[PDB]
């Protein structure tokens, strides 16, 4: 269940252990799921509602949501969450290509006429 996005079943099973409490490890698991989902939502979509954000993450409505947003950015609006948008820095570049292409072509010609 954990290998892919299926997470509702994970939290459902966290309350189902035939052996014992196992809170010791499922705790750590809850924390490492919270932070991962917080990281993944940063790029899934442009906007979220505050109630919807509070509910998709399994915590309720405590100051915990506010604190989690504070720990990150998640600047609010009028019941609005702004998307962090950049995704355009890398493109339109040739100089590094214009150097490593030169290296590559020199390497082609290196072992082409000299006896090997």
């Amino acid at each position: 269940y954990l290998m892919e996005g299926s997470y509702n079943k994970v939290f459902l099973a966290k309350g189902n252990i035939p052996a014992e409490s196992y809170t010791f490890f499922i705790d750590i698991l809850l924390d490492t799921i919270r932070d991962e989902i917080a990281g993944c939502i940063e790029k899934a979509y442009e906007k979220i509602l505050f109630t919807e954000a509070t509910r998709i993450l399994f915590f309720n409505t405590p100051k915990k949501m506010t604190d989690y947003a504070k720990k990150r950015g998640w600047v609010l609006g009028p019941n609005n969450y702004y998307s962090f948008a950049s995704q355009q820095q890398k493109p339109e570049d040739t100089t590094i290509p214009s150097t490593e292409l030169a290296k590559q072509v020199i390497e082609y010609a290196r072992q082409l006429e000299m006896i090997v």
């Binding site: 150097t99 292409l101 030169a102 072509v105």
Partner: protein
Amino acid sequence: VIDAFRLINANMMVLGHEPRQTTSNLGHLNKPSIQALIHGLNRHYYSITINYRKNELEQKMLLNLHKKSWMEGLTLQDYSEHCKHNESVVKEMLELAKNYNKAVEEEDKMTPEQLAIKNVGKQDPKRHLEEHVDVLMTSNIVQCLAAMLDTVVFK
């Protein structure tokens, strides 16, 4: 073809002597041609060895022959004719490749002694093919390197 000569007096052979009393190997390092020897040569005149006086300065300045302007090294060869030349050459590569396998199939069905003669009248695909590969690669490498150097050295 340069040579140097000097006369000898027939008096010396009247005595029965020969000219050029000799003390060293270094005169005999060459032989005259038959054509030079039909004419008088040793029975009338004798040759002298020659060598060339040189100094470094004139050599240092003579080797400039066929050196060329720096700017010539950075030209991009008219990108519109380049592709025309390329996909002109590829066509004869086509028509030759379709003629290669016949000469591959006939590799052994006849006496190899006459196989040399099999070349003489008729061009062979194998040797005639690879010079096109040489041309294509030599051109397309440098055409690509120069563009990179330009797109870095200016702005």
